[PDB]
Ligand binder design. Sequence first.
Ligand SMILES: CC(C)CN(C[C@@H](O)[C@H](Cc1ccccc1)NC(=O)O[C@H]1CCOC1)S(=O)(=O)c1ccc(N)cc1
Ligand SMILES: [Cl-]
Ligand SMILES: [Cl-]
Ligand SMILES: [Cl-]
Ligand SMILES: [Cl-]
Ligand SMILES: [Cl-]
Ligand SMILES: [Cl-]
Ligand SMILES: [Cl-]
Ligand SMILES: [Cl-]
Ligand code: NA
Ligand SMILES: [Zn+2]
Ligand SMILES: [Zn+2]
Ligand SMILES: [Zn+2]
Ligand SMILES: [Zn+2]
Ligand SMILES: [Zn+2]
Ligand SMILES: [Zn+2]
Lengths: 99, 99
Amino acid sequence: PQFSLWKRPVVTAYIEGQPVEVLLDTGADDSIVAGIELGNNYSPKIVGGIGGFINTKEYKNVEIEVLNKKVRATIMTGDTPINIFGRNILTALGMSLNL
Amino acid sequence: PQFSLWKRPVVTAYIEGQPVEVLLDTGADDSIVAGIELGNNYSPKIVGGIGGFINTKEYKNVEIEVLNKKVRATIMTGDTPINIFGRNILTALGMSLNL
Ligand SMILES: CC(C)CN(C[C@@H](O)[C@H](Cc1ccccc1)NC(=O)O[C@H]1CCOC1)S(=O)(=O)c1ccc(N)cc1
Ligand SMILES: [Cl-]
Ligand SMILES: [Cl-]
Ligand SMILES: [Cl-]
Ligand SMILES: [Cl-]
Ligand SMILES: [Cl-]
Ligand SMILES: [Cl-]
Ligand SMILES: [Cl-]
Ligand SMILES: [Cl-]
Ligand code: NA
Ligand SMILES: [Zn+2]
Ligand SMILES: [Zn+2]
Ligand SMILES: [Zn+2]
Ligand SMILES: [Zn+2]
Ligand SMILES: [Zn+2]
Ligand SMILES: [Zn+2]
């Protein structure tokens, strides 16, 4: 798998078996997805980026399948406009950014 | 150059001679830098991030020096909390995401 970055590197992931399109993002430390409910056992966190801050819910040991691999990783849920898989998941997948 | 993503893929660069710390961000379409002054030859643009929208000043054909390369690229200046080189510069440098 190689993403040449001429388009957004976006793929299909399954989170707790629910399909979501996600952006593979080296500029994000963590991962954030909208439109899925992961339940009542979370820790509330605030994240900031361009345009401001949002409230998130942090969930640990969540089942994720992406790029033909299955991993358990930390996921935040929140009103993000796009679903982001940040470096915590990219490293669990063994991905690298190369020049 | 390989970035293994266990730490942020941050480097230093020069933008028309001005030193900056920048994050290599596959999740950004554009490149946005705060604080530097590129002058009055710009067009306003509107950029959307995780928290909403900001106005930016768009400068074309800007010289930038990064990773021992010299390219000319479009830079936007505006209120980002982290300077980011997005896919317009990553593709100019020939970078890719690999698994
Ligand atoms: C801005 C960086 C430093 C951090 N952001 C990641 C970036 O890749 C961010 C991802 C994104 C793309 C499109 C819309 C909304 C978000 N791209 C981004 O804003 O693109 C803009 C600026 C130029 O072109 C368009 S983040 O989303 O705020 C963020 C922060 C913390 C966590 N844990 C996760 C995400
Ligand atoms: Cl290389
Ligand atoms: Cl690393
Ligand atoms: Cl490291
Ligand atoms: Cl390292
Ligand atoms: Cl210089
Ligand atoms: Cl854009
Ligand atoms: Cl615009
Ligand atoms: Cl934009
Ligand atoms: Na609980
Ligand atoms: Zn499956
Ligand atoms: Zn909303
Ligand atoms: Zn490292
Ligand atoms: Zn120079
Ligand atoms: Zn730093
Ligand atoms: Zn844009």
